[PDB]
Amino acid sequence: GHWGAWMPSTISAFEGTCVSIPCRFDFPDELRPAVVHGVWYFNSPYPKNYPPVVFKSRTQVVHESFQGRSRLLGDLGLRNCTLLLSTLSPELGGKYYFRGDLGGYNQYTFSEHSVLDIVNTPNIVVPPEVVAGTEVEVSCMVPDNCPELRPELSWLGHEGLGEPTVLGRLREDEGTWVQVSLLHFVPTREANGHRLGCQAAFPNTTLQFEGYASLDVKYPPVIVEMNSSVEAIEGSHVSLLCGADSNPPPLLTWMRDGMVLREAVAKSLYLDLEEVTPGEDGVYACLAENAYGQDNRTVELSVMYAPWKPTVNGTVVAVEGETVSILCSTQSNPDPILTIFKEKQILATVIYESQLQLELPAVTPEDDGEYWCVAENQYGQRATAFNLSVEFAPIILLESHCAAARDTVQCLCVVKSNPEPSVAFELPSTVNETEREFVYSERSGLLLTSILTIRGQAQAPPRVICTSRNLYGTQSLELPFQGA
Amino acid sequence: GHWGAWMPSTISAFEGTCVSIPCRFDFPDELRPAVVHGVWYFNSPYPKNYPPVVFKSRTQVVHESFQGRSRLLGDLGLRNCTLLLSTLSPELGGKYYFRGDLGGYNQYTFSEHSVLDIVNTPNIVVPPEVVAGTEVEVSCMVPDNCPELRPELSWLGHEGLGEPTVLGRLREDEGTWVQVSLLHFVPTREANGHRLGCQAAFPNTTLQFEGYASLDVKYPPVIVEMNSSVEAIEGSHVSLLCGADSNPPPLLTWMRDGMVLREAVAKSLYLDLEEVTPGEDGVYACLAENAYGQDNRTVELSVMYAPWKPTVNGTVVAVEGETVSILCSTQSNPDPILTIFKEKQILATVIYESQLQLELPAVTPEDDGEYWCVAENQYGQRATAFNLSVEFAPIILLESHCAAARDTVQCLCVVKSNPEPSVAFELPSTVNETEREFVYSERSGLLLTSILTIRGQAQAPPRVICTSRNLYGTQSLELPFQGA
Numbered sequence: 018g019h020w021g022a023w024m025p026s027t028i029s030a031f032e033g034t035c036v037s038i039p040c041r042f043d044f045p046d047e048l049r050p051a052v053v054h055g056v057w058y059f060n061s062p063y064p065k066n067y068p069p070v071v072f073k074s075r076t077q078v079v080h081e082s083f084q085g086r087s088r089l090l091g092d093l094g095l096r097n098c099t100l101l102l103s104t105l106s107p108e109l110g111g112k113y114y115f116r117g118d119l120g121g122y123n124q125y126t127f128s129e130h131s132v133l134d135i136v137n138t139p140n141i142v143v144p145p146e147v148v149a150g151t152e153v154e155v156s157c158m159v160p161d162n163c164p165e166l167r168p169e170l171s172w173l174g175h176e177g178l179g180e181p182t183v184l185g186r187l188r189e190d191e192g193t194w195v196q197v198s199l200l201h202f203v204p205t206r207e208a209n210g211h212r213l214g215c216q217a218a219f220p221n222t223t224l225q226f227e228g229y230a231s232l233d234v235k236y237p238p239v240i241v242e243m244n245s246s247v248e249a250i251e252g253s254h255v256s257l258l259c260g261a262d263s264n265p266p267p268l269l270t271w272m273r274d275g276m277v278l279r280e281a282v283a284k285s286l287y288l289d290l291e292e293v294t295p296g297e298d299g300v301y302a303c304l305a306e307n308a309y310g311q312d313n314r315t316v317e318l319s320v321m322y323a324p325w326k327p328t329v330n331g332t333v334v335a336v337e338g339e340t341v342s343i344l345c346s347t348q349s350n351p352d353p354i355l356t357i358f359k360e361k362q363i364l365a366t367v368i369y370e371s372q373l374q375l376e377l378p379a380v381t382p383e384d385d386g387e388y389w390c391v392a393e394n395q396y397g398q399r400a401t402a403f404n405l406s407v408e409f410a411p412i413i414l415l416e417s418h419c420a421a422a423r424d425t426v427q428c429l430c431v432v433k434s435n436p437e438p439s440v441a442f443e444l445p446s447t448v449n450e451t452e453r454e455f456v457y458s459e460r461s462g463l464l465l466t467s468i469l470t471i472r473g474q475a476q477a478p479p480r481v482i483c484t485s486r487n488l489y490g491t492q493s494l495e496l497p498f499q500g501a
Numbered sequence: 502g503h504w505g506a507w508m509p510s511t512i513s514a515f516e517g518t519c520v521s522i523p524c525r526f527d528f529p530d531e532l533r534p535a536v537v538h539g540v541w542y543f544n545s546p547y548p549k550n551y552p553p554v555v556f557k558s559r560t561q562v563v564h565e566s567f568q569g570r571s572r573l574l575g576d577l578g579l580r581n582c583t584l585l586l587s588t589l590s591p592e593l594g595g596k597y598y599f600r601g602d603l604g605g606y607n608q609y610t611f612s613e614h615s616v617l618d619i620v621n622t623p624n625i626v627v628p629p630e631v632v633a634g635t636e637v638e639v640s641c642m643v644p645d646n647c648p649e650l651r652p653e654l655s656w657l658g659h660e661g662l663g664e665p666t667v668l669g670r671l672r673e674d675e676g677t678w679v680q681v682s683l684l685h686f687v688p689t690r691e692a693n694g695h696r697l698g699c700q701a702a703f704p705n706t707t708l709q710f711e712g713y714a715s716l717d718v719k720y721p722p723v724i725v726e727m728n729s730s731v732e733a734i735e736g737s738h739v740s741l742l743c744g745a746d747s748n749p750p751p752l753l754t755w756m757r758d759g760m761v762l763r764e765a766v767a768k769s770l771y772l773d774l775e776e777v778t779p780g781e782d783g784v785y786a787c788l789a790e791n792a793y794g795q796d797n798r799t800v801e802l803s804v805m806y807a808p809w810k811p812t813v814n815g816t817v818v819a820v821e822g823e824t825v826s827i828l829c830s831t832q833s834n835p836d837p838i839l840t841i842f843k844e845k846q847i848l849a850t851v852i853y854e855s856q857l858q859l860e861l862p863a864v865t866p867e868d869d870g871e872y873w874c875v876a877e878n879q880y881g882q883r884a885t886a887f888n889l890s891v892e893f894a895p896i897i898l899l900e901s902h903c904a905a906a907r908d909t910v911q912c913l914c915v916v917k918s919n920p921e922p923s924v925a926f927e928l929p930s931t932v933n934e935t936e937r938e939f940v941y942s943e944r945s946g947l948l949l950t951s952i953l954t955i956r957g958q959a960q961a962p963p964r965v966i967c968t969s970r971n972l973y974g975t976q977s978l979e980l981p982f983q984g985a
């Protein structure tokens with residue numbers, strides 16, 4: 018054929034082991050020179066620029082960087098120029114050209130070259146996506162290009178994961194071999210961040226090459242941080258925390274009542290509430306969702322505040338004996354105990370209830386007066402006042418009398434009634450020049466107090482009769498005298 | 502001498518009597534004709550214009566208006582041509598010329614003529630000013646020019662006035678006589694407007710001639726119309742009347758307090774007062790003054806109106822047992838009876854006095870309350886209100902108790918005091934999580950009503966002790982319980 022050569026492009030082995038660069042070459046058959054000679058140049062391809070001599074036919078003298086480090090396999094007559102390099106060092110990493118020298122001027126450095134890689138760590142392969150719920154296999158590939166040493170693979174750190182299935186050397190690229198050992202297992206959610214190792218060693222040697230890899234198994238989110246039932250005060254500051262554990266980024270969503278609120282892709286998400294209202298009260302849910310699953314939790318938020326000022330509706334005015342129904346109603350976030358009461362006495366009390374009802378079957382006059390409803394509670398108390406008035410027929414009090422002075426007589430009669438009664442004075446006497454009797458009447462509470470003055474009345478005290486009328490009834494007391 | 506004649510200018514007598522026109526004439530002595538003749542022409546002086554012939558020598562034929570009515574006295578030889586005309590009538594009033602006819606062409610009508618007045622009424626003379634206090638004389642003159650009849654004068658209507666002093670005939674002007682009768686008297690104030698008369702009559706005849714005159718005696722003013730003590734209402738209308746009796750115009754002057762007010766020259770003078778004030782009250786004097794005297798009277802004017810609203814000054818605040826002095830003072834035009842009083846009781850009363858004083862030696866708490874001072878009176882009543890407050894050490898009322906409910910206990914203690922006392926609750930227990938006790942305290946009158954609620958207290962009722970402090974004192978009641 019024509020000039021040329023076959024050689025692997027890339028080839029590799031470990032520090033301290035050998036390599037075996039396989040090859041083959043060709044020259045024009047047209048020439049028949051016996052004793053085919055060749056040379057192996059490191060780094061550089063042509064003689065002009067002196068390269069290190071890896072091998073040269075019928076010369077023990079080579080580069081000191083290969084002395085006792087190189088040897089050729091195969092008769093070059095059969096065009097077989099495979100080269101072995103024992104005891105490798107990082108220095109020996111480089112490109113290796115091959116050149117042939119048959120006869121004179123028939124010398125050719127072949128353009129195809131192999132590049133020698135020297136690694137000190139094995140190769141662990143892992144698929145891009147490693148879902149937790151799915152079986153996933155991983156391999157371990159080590160360049161078995163050495164005829165003198167035979168690597169054996171050992172999964173370390175595999176622990177509880179399934180046992181390794183060993184495989185032999187396999188064809189890599191064109192003309193290079195590699196020993197592979199597989200590993201079949203299933204990953205827990207936790208498995209992410211676990212360090213998995215593969216070790217290659219050689220039976221008689223002290224050579225051991227370890228190599229690590231940390232897995233990245235994807236798992237759905239599990240909400241691990243969530244508040245218990247939160248009970249907060251109005252206007253206070255409320256921080257809700259939703260934590261989530263997921264390998265892929267999780268999406269966090271705060272929701273309540275079918276609404277959006279706050280949403281973010283993070284490991285934890287705060288919901289800050291300022292100026293808290295009873296409308297903020299309710300159950301809040303945090304939803305965590307990932308393409309690989311989801312999880313959600315709820316928390317009951319309870320807003321607590323002192324009850325509002327009580328509202329009292331019912332009956333304000335009522336005649337005697339009628340039945341007065343009064344209810345005192347107040348909404349409160351924390352259940353509260355409340356009570357209503359007049360001065361000097363407490364009418365009714367209810368405990369931990371929304372509203373209290375007071376009923377007075379028959380109403381005496383003493384029921385007239387202002388009342389108080391207090392909505393007592395842990396977080397504060399507010400009250401409200403309501404008045405209850407009671408109407409009745411006027412009652413002329415026996416505190417009434419006719420005191421006479423030396424020249425004139427004057428009388429006082431007091432009655433009580435809620436509708437202020439028409440006071441009047443009568444006396445059996447005819448009409449006189451005036452000298453007109455004149456009364457004055459001031460009112461305080463239910464009491465109508467009125468004082469008459471009859472002037473120039475004879476020493477014999479005149480019968481004075483007091484009468485007062487309201488809508489409901491009438492009364493008339495013939496007044497007494499208080500001499501000396 | 503020369504031609505000429507003497508004759509009275511004016512001369513008069515009554516209807517029905519005679520006249521006696523005296524005369525005398527003269528002609529040039531140079532001529533000596535015997536048998537001097539003359540004529541008396543009425544009205545006209547010369548013959549050309551025919552006049553009535555009163556007399557003509559040696560002719561019985563005269564004017565028919567003088568036939569048997571005329572006659573001549575004295576020989577014309579002695580130049581005496583006096584003429585008498587009996588039975589006079591109003592017709593015979595006129596001028597009378599005299600003319601002489603001695604010889605031919607020696608005829609002369611003398612330029613001097615007498616005019617005959619005929620009156621039917623006497624002449625009464627009165628001085629211009631007739632002061633009442635002064636003696637004043639009046640005369641009565643009657644023309645005594647008749648030789649045949651002799652008038653006699655008689656004062657009629659003179660009555661109580663001094664008797665008349667008769668006088669004889671007196672020389673009037675030149676050649677006429679008049680009978681005068683005087684009258685000496687003194688005039689009362691009343692005498693003005695009195696009719697005084699003088700009558701002349703003749704003994705044998707039926708002829709009587711009366712003549713009157715009404716006197717105008719000046720007298721000082723005497724105030725005869727004057728009001729008694731006038732007692733009037735404010736804003737009413739007041740008419741003061743001052744009447745005065747005087748012949749000359751009197752000057753009327755209304756005065757008070759040394760001031761002018763109203764002044765007028767009249768018989769009566771009104772002082773009208775509208776919108777009467779207590780400042781109008783006082784004594785008003787009416788002065789009457791005339792150049793001939795003066796008189797004056799006074800009237801007390803009293804303005805009456807309901808008392809003003811009472812003013813109460815003194816002490817409003819006072820501790821227990823202290824003495825409270827309060828006075829209620831009110832000015833009033835009509836004296837009024839007033840009184841002060843609380844509800845249901847009347848403290849004090851005074852009658853017909855300007856002010857009333859109330860004193861409360863020791864002040865109990867029940868003295869706290871509003872008081873009324875009413876200034877009662879005939880013409881209206883007004884009042885005023887004053888409050889009296891009384892401070893004292895708080896008194897914890899035995900209406901207080903500790904009522905327990907099934908889950909919680911609540912206590913009520915009421916105290917009374919005017920300075921609102923600091924209520925407090927104590928109990929022998931250490932500090933607990935809260936669950937904080939909470940009290941409510943409303944105030945009404947002197948009563949501080951307060952209710953505690955102690956929550957979750959064990960079935961065994963805890964000792965509750967109520968304490969209240971004011972400036973004056975402190976009290977503490979260990980409260981009781983009311984089971985079932």
Ligand SMILES: CC(=O)N[C@@H]1[C@@H](O[C@@H]2O[C@H](CO)[C@H](O)[C@H](O[C@]3(C(=O)O)C[C@H](O)[C@@H](NC(C)=O)[C@H]([C@H](O)[C@H](O)CO)O3)[C@H]2O)[C@@H](O)[C@@H](CO)O[C@H]1O
Pocket residue numbers: 063064065122123124125126127128
């Ligand atoms: C041709 C070429 O691309 N070479 C360039 C380089 O120059 C080389 O220099 C060396 C120095 O000894 C040689 O002269 C070489 O030619 C020879 C050799 O000795 O390798 C002569 C041989 O006889 C000849 N072949 C045959 C069949 O006779 C060989 C052979 O053709 C080549 O080696 C094949 O690669 O070549 C010169 O080629 C030098 O200029 C470098 C850098 O500039 O560039 C090369 O392209």
Ligand SMILES: CC(=O)N[C@@H]1[C@@H](O[C@@H]2O[C@H](CO)[C@H](O)[C@H](O[C@]3(C(=O)O)C[C@H](O)[C@@H](NC(C)=O)[C@H]([C@H](O)[C@H](O)CO)O3)[C@H]2O)[C@@H](O)[C@@H](CO)O[C@H]1O
Pocket residue numbers: 547548549606607608609610611612
């Ligand atoms: C002079 C005179 O003022 N007279 C005026 C009037 O005229 C008279 O008319 C009468 C008519 O008879 C006489 O003519 C009068 O004269 C006499 C008489 O007869 O009275 C004539 C007498 O002789 C003569 N006196 C003497 C001494 O002789 C008298 C005598 O002198 C007067 O009487 C004296 O008063 O007069 C006329 O005088 C006549 O015109 C009236 C109206 O117009 O006015 C007279 O002034």
Ligand SMILES: *[C@@H]1O[C@H](CO[C@@H]2O[C@@H](C)[C@@H](O)[C@@H](O)[C@@H]2O)[C@@H](O)[C@H](O)[C@H]1NC(C)=O
Pocket residue numbers: 328330331346347348
């Ligand atoms: C009277 O009103 C009662 C309660 O009033 C309502 O509730 C209170 C807490 C406040 O919110 C107030 O504003 C509300 O109006 C009712 O429950 C009751 O049925 C009503 N009925 C009447 C008029 O007696």
Ligand SMILES: *[C@@H]1O[C@H](CO[C@@H]2O[C@@H](C)[C@@H](O)[C@@H](O)[C@@H]2O)[C@@H](O)[C@H](O)[C@H]1NC(C)=O
Pocket residue numbers: 812814815830831832
């Ligand atoms: C308090 O005042 C008394 C009276 O007040 C006066 O008289 C009354 C009628 C009203 O006219 C009022 O305007 C006047 O001021 C005094 O008489 C008394 O002296 C006073 N003394 C006090 C202050 O106690």
Ligand SMILES: *[C@@H]1O[C@H](CO)[C@@H](O)[C@H](O)[C@H]1NC(C)=O
Pocket residue numbers: 041090091095097098099
């Ligand atoms: C070249 O020699 C090597 C070592 O003897 C051998 O492995 C390879 O098969 C040979 N190649 C040939 C003969 O083509």
Ligand SMILES: *[C@@H]1O[C@H](CO)[C@@H](O)[C@H](O)[C@H]1NC(C)=O
Pocket residue numbers: 242243244247255256257258
């Ligand atoms: C909820 O829990 C977080 C810790 O995970 C805490 O910081 C926060 O205060 C809690 N929320 C409330 C309202 O206490």
Ligand SMILES: *[C@@H]1O[C@H](CO)[C@@H](O)[C@H](O)[C@H]1NC(C)=O
Pocket residue numbers: 302304311312313
């Ligand atoms: C929580 O997730 C479940 C499924 O895991 C879903 O059925 C449910 O509706 C979710 N709840 C909320 C409030 O999102």
Ligand SMILES: *[C@@H]1O[C@H](CO)[C@@H](O)[C@H](O)[C@H]1NC(C)=O
Pocket residue numbers: 386387402403404
């Ligand atoms: C109730 O009546 C009292 C009088 O005793 C009065 O002071 C108060 O203002 C009244 N309150 C209402 C709400 O009517």
Ligand SMILES: *[C@@H]1O[C@H](CO)[C@@H](O)[C@H](O)[C@H]1NC(C)=O
Pocket residue numbers: 525574575579581582583
């Ligand atoms: C005129 O005569 C009368 C009457 O005889 C007489 O009164 C008067 O004195 C006589 N006058 C004389 C004479 O002068």
Ligand SMILES: *[C@@H]1O[C@H](CO)[C@@H](O)[C@H](O)[C@H]1NC(C)=O
Pocket residue numbers: 726727728731739740741742
């Ligand atoms: C005073 O008296 C007159 C009558 O002389 C009378 O008209 C008037 O009304 C009186 N005045 C009063 C105030 O009565």
Ligand SMILES: *[C@@H]1O[C@H](CO)[C@@H](O)[C@H](O)[C@H]1NC(C)=O
Pocket residue numbers: 786788795796797
């Ligand atoms: C009244 O008149 C007398 C004299 O008649 C006099 O002294 C007195 O001052 C007068 N009074 C008045 C108030 O004018």
Ligand SMILES: *[C@@H]1O[C@H](CO)[C@@H](O)[C@H](O)[C@H]1NC(C)=O
Pocket residue numbers: 870871886887888
């Ligand atoms: C007096 O006190 C009463 C309360 O009992 C009040 O209603 C009234 O307005 C007070 N009056 C004065 C003048 O202070």
Ligand SMILES: *[C@H]1O[C@H](CO)[C@@H](O)[C@H](O)[C@@H]1O
Pocket residue numbers: 018019020044045
């Ligand atoms: C080798 O030398 C050159 C390389 O192409 C050619 O002349 C021929 O292929 C020969 O075999």
Ligand SMILES: *[C@H]1O[C@H](CO)[C@@H](O)[C@H](O)[C@@H]1O
Pocket residue numbers: 502503504528529
């Ligand atoms: C009368 O006549 C006239 C009047 O004066 C005069 O001549 C004389 O006075 C005589 O006596």
